[model samples]
Target: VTSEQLLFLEAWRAVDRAYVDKSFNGQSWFKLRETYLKKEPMDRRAQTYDAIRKMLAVLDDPFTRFLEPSRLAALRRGTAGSVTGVGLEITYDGGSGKDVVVLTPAPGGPAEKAGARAGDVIVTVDGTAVKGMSLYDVSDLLQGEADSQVEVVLHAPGAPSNTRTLQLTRQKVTINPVTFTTCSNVAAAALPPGAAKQQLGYVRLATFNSNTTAAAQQAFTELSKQGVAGLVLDIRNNGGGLFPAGVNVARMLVDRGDLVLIADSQGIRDIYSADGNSIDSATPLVVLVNRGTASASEVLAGALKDSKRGLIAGERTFGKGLIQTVVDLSDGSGVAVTVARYQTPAGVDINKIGVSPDVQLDPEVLPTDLEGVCRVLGSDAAPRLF
Candidate 1:
């Protein structure tokens, strides 16, 4: 057996020790490790990757996965605080019959500059249809040499015929996490006749990153000076990042209560409280979420919903509550072991079943529904197309 097998063994042992499912997907984990360490074919790097993937496949948990060197490198770059691509957060919409779906375009990125928003179906990328491709595969295809231009074809969610084509340039996208704008009564739902033109503050968090906390705080501080009647925090199409940053954002909105709960194989291990660093409590808040909102994004939205801190509108979020610990092997390969599962403060185990919104709107509804939001925040009723 080559050292490649050792890499595989490393992955196996990491999962064997830390996987949340101690049953190990109902298989004998140690026996399987022994079965693979000596016999699994791993003479080359590709073979080892394949072997690792094959082993992980048996676990049947998608989040507990293997990342090859290149993919692992890419993931590291993403977490290191920025992204390089056309700047769209995409997911293979499992519930939407496997179409490539755009969660939301990053603010100030190419996709947003080109008018891409959440619920856009990416029909093709550079003439390659992403219909049957995995999310990672699609992501790889979207990222190429920096400064290179790629043609993308997209359609509106439900109305497929309403399509648009964009020639986007790839770059190392430096995202400013928070984008603030004041909706002068018109950016929201239509006003009937002679209603007061109430001003609402719209703050869109592109993705939670190292810059999120300060950026969001500054935006809120500035928006407060502008006298916003209510606030809409849009995390739509925000493929989450930086777990602590997500919790920090939640902390800004909430004062005191259970914010999150963490559980391992044994049972609940820890719970996070509001920590009393709340920024705004009097202003009515609404969090906008969609199928693209995941991970850290879910943590913020789930906290707001569970604590009655804000009204969550839009569709059910992307259900990815499993926590993974990424382990890098000596050979530079990485294995993300599913170490624990997380829950909202309400103790709802939102794994595959995501957090439900208080108000559900169609894909084309409430992105800017001021009237509906007024109904909710005004009475805290709840409603989303954002």
Candidate 2:
């Protein structure tokens, strides 16, 4: 067999060993290896990868796919919560044939220095219109080796008719997924002197990643020292990264109870329980989640809710309890095999069906800020709002 054939078979065998369903979607799983090896022309590396990809697609699992070496590196950096991009935090505005909204430019980063502001709508990147593109694709277009340049068309905030183009350099930006603040720190100056205010710690978990648990721990420790009365943990737009990172963050609040149950093709596999390291279990907490709250974020929210450690508000979560385990081949390339699925502490399987909030708010009425967080969690509550 050629070296290319060996590489292809390595990827196949990795999946063969650990894919969640041994039934192989009702087809002959082992026969697939011989089918490709015997007939397929895998002489070139590209041809071998194509065969691997086609074989994975037959499994009918979207999450189980091959990753080239470059892609695996990118995925690793993304899960580690560091980025090499233009430093513009952006997302699709959910309107097809429309604009990409810039949430904020990273402070002191390339985009911010180049005058890209929050609320500006991105029209095009690198002379190509971004219509019908996803945030992930658009972001890829904006990121490259440091000192590389990308041109972006923008509509100034609130003025779609007013457009401008700016060429910006790509640079490495360290992203901290956790942003810490306080209710009193943000609102006290704005409120009248006599107005009522609660000393509440506010922590926004933008994404779950390797660095997330440490950052969150620091936030909780600082807030505890500040003597906050309550806490607001916002997981809006938290497309989850590391499952263990999410479990670790959940333990920060929960003193007891099972956090999440991992079930592989083999019977119930493992359960992540609260193993101490709780910051302040008695502090009343309100977890703010939205449809962007998915996977590991869903795990954190489920743990808090099932343990009665916190109450959740805002929209129902983005259900993605399926877990993908990355299997590395002999080469740097790998395959992400769907090896298990997660269930909440209550034994609820939240695959396509997400976790429902105790208090559901309209999509537009998200608990993203201090005002919104208070509106969702304390409109009518024993956790009263004044």
Candidate 3:
């Protein structure tokens, strides 16, 4: 081993000795030794990150991960508050496993310009297969500078489908992860059942991004003008983003106090709270979440539920309680490191363990016609695709 490694090993062994002698029996030292440098191969620094990842995974926390430099770069690009693509958010669905299904098109964006409609699945990108890809994987594939041309193959929703390839010129688009629409429950049912349509106003937070609060404020303002009785916030399949955005939303929902906190071995950081009387402090609130809901999404869901501010509905939320800090790399790529673990108001760890919903609404039990939900929302009209 190199001198640096040797020094590290010595320091590590000293820490181990202290833990074994003074910490929790010998178990804490054992954990430290095994996690840091007790592997068989002495030359294992290259794999140190992988070892830590497996260690965190043992906790079954979905939010824990070790993002390499390249992956970090992609995340930073997204965080810089801009992205380039055909303007569609796609997810993987069943099929050849190569199809990246388009969930929706960004309004007045490149994907809309390219005629990409919701339910259209991207099967390939510039001849590269996209089957079995994650949403971020697909996003990395599509993102590029403005006006760059890339050919995307699609398997549009519905039968007897043939793969159709479309050439799209890229454009830079600012993605606003949060948005909402006021509609009768009937219209909401016609669209994704996960969408909001109660007598209360509706807020659809697609992503937890930088501008979510401003957008939510505008939506709440318009809804207030209409005198909404309740509020439904939809956060399904929303892979979380910025911490600040989630904090802002949570603060808006409750009293100006320590609503949520981020904790580490060091201490706790109060992350969210509301100031002054804003929107309904106690409206009949309901939050919708599913297995795809994660990160900051889970934060909002957990905060509202724990504060007795809202009732969580739908399936179990994807547990992602670890907070990540974006670190820039030399290669223009970046890394997302686990900087801290977020805690609910009650000090419960929500890492891979998600918050259970109060009202369990199974979509399958509901009628396929979805007429009932819409009727509840008070709309005679059908819902439209977003």
Candidate 4:
């Protein structure tokens, strides 16, 4: 067997033994091995990469992904709560035929300083036109050593020429997972004139990273100092990160209970319990979540809702309950294979079926209209939309 065949077989055996849901999602594992074995390409490195991609695609698990060296490096930076980049959040616009669209720029960051705005379409990076580039490929071009410069060609919608190239300097952008403002301040801007102060604490969590628990604790500490009557913990578009961070954040909110139950393929269970050293678990609380709230964020939401420590509002969470263990290969590349499945504290399996909210808000409803959600937290109102 060639070196390419050896890499493929090593990854194949790794997933076969560890994948959370056995039976290989109802497909024969040995059959997939034999099928790919006969057609292993010998010459090109690109063909070898494609063969590995095809092997992983058969599992149909989105969380389990193949990471080349550069991509793996990006993941490591993200986990560290910082990245060297122009500081823009972007997404692929498949329906519009646009390869990438700027979601938002980090506040006071290089991307905004270079004149890039939200909703702008990224046409080119560093002089190369990325007409059909993948998000990973586009992201790779934007990240590098701090102070390095990259030229970005952007197409702003409805502008006169609709296109311009801006030279952006890359810097270390700290990803702050937690951001806070008093509900009174939000109500002042969002509500009509002369509304009474709600005196609620609002903390929006971007994602669960290494800094999540600290960020959340700091927000809670400040809110408590302000003498806020209630709190709204928002995990609206959070895609989740470190599992331990999620458990720690839950620990901060719930006074007593199991945060989650981690179960491996062999049925061994480990219960992570709250230390009962919460800041103020008795404070009236409402947890805000939506479709993008997944993984570790889902773990936080499930623990809160099941333990009855907080009321859940907004849409059903993005159900991603399986845990992926990153396996570093001999080469620079690595594979994230699903190794375990976690259940909520109440033993609910939210793998595909997400955690439902206590009060389901309309998908189109704005987060500012806190009348229903706030009421759910302070009073026992039936689950109804505002």
Candidate 5:
């Protein structure tokens, strides 16, 4: 053993008595000659980190993996708001092995007027086949210079079962965290006769981004003015944004108390709670989720669903319960590494085991069925909007 390796080994074994009985350590300590050992600290450090990472993987959770130090910078940028693209969040539904559309085009955004519908499968982009691409890769492909045109191939519903292409111009899409609509009177197009009798309010939260909390406050205030008795919290296709945004949105519905719990191999790190007062706690609420709802969105949905504080409707959620930390590299890139695991109120892991809805609806169902799921019951008699 080199002098430095010997010293590190001694300190390592001393700090944790459990290391003494490990066969690998025992062999290294007993077989190496201390006098001939050269202490190359840098080499030892890299090996030490690599070994630890592999050890973590032994836990059998795909969510836990080692990230190279060089990946840190890019990870940080991807985790935060520092991103440029067509402004969409996406996830893969393990059940179908296809990319599930998570967000509709942002209002007044390029894709919005172009009819880039949410829930439409993105099969190909810019001639690149995306059948097996990861969410990150899809985001990268959608990015380009503002006002530049990109062609996308979409697999839509009620189709001939073939791909169709649409061309859209990229732009600096600005995302608003919240949008509110009063349903005191459901749109004739939005409701069935039975559902038309009930007053409703709908709030669509696309992401928990920078402006989420403020937007949420404004949305609720507007809905409150209309005296809405029931509310639909639409979080479909929301790829979670910021953690704080989740906390803030939770406060809008849940009362003061424990809201979520975060844990990892190291154990629980923090317990988040809702504020004492929630603006819509007493109001009947139905939360809408789909396979694309993930991360921060999972946190909020799990809290509400597990607490039985509200009814969760829609499809199953995308199981992305792990929290990633982005590290910035010297290069203008970074890597996103999963650092912690998060759970809902009942401690159900959201990682690979996404948030399950209390009520499940088929995403492929006709729009007639979707209207009822959207709280416009009696949708059987309604006209199909799509």
Candidate 6:
């Protein structure tokens, strides 16, 4: 066989040996290998890429994907909780029928320093109009050489006519996953009538990565020193990163038991238990999740709810339960293949079917909206400490 055929076979065998779904979603794996081998492509690289891409697509798992060299490097950086960019998390808002809007700026990052705020729509990047560009394209435009300045024009949501220009310098920004604030002056106006007043500790976890577990622990220590009566864990737009970080975060508050179950293709079950090192197990805990909360975030939320350690409030989770194993190819490219499916301690499947919150609120509430969070926590239906 040629070099392309050899690489193709390696990928095929990797999936066959480790894929979570043994049936390959009803497709004949042998037939796919045969078909791709007969086809002529531009080069060995393209042929190998196409074969692997097609094979993974049939599994219908979005998390399993092929990453080119550059993308794989980016993924590595992302998993490390650092990126060379202006430090803005953005999303396309079709509701306004216009542009990509800034979701939030990383705390104390360049975008925030440049006056970027939530609901600001990007108009241009470096003098190039971003009207028809995809979010990926716009993101690429925002990232360049470290210390390089990018000119960005943005329009605030309510005042579309008052466009402002910002010169943001790109740098190696470290995304600290956990940040906390003692709830003293936050108004509970959005809360339901006749709710009790409590001193709550608010912690917003942006993403689960290398820095997550440690950062969260540090935040909790600080909040505990302030004598907080309750805790609110905000995991709204967090798409998740390291799986171990999720388990570690769960262990920080939950009892010693099975935190999550990992099942492979061969009917083998591996139960991951907590280390019995709960930080503040007695505190009244409320977890806030939305549609953007996915992967390892779901793992943490589902564990908390199933173990009765925390009350999940807000929208349903993003429903991603597949465990992806990143395999670095010899050529610098890589593949993230689905090797297992995760289940909550109660044996509830989190894949396709997300974890439903105990206290469901309006789906439109932004995660960073303090008033909305205050109202949700202030409601009489909020979770109580046992």
lDDT of 3 by residue, 22-127 (tens): 3323245456555556553445544543543443343322323345555755665572444577777664443324455775566456766667655577778888
lDDT of 6 by residue, 296-382 (tens): 889899999988888888878767677778887767777788898888888877886878898887544433555555555456544
lDDT of each: 0.76, 0.74, 0.60, 0.72, 0.61, 0.74
Question: What are the per-model numbers of colliding residue pairs?
Answer: 10, 0, 13, 0, 22, 0
What is the lDDT for 193 in model 4?
30
For model 5, the superposed segments whose C-alpha errors exceed 4 Å read 1-84, 92-124, 129-138, 154-161, 185-197, 328-335, 362-386
lDDT of 2 by residue, 1-386 (tens): 88998999888888888888888888688798889899888878889988998888788775577888887777677622335677776644423234566755664567777876555789889988875454446777887777778899999856988988888877776656787866653344222224334567779887776789899999998987877776778786666778888988888888788999988667678899998879878776778776667778888888888898887877787676788789988779889898888888888876766677886655344344546654444333223211
Off by over 4 Å in 3: 1-75, 79-176, 181-198, 266-271, 326-335, 363-376, 379-386
Best by TM-score: 1
Q: Which candidate is the best by lDDT?
A: 1
Model 4 segments more than 4 A misplaced: 1-3, 43-47, 74-138, 141-173, 181-198, 222-227, 263-269, 362-386
- At residue 59, candidate 4 shows an lDDT of 75
- What's the distance in Å from true for residue 78, model 2? 5.9
**Residue 229 CA displacement from its true place in model 6, Å:** 2.9
lDDT of 3 at 45: 45
Q: Choose 3 or 5, whichever is better by lDDT.
A: 5
- Candidate 3 shows a clash count of 13
Per-residue error for 55 in candidate 6, Å, reads 3.6
Those runs of model 1 whose alpha carbons end farther than 4 Å from true positions after fitting are 44-46, 78-83, 95-101, 111-137, 151-167, 181-199, 222-228, 362-386
lDDT tens digits, residues 74-118, model 4? 777662334578877665441335456675565457887777655
Model 2: which ten-residue window has the lowest total lDDT? 377-386
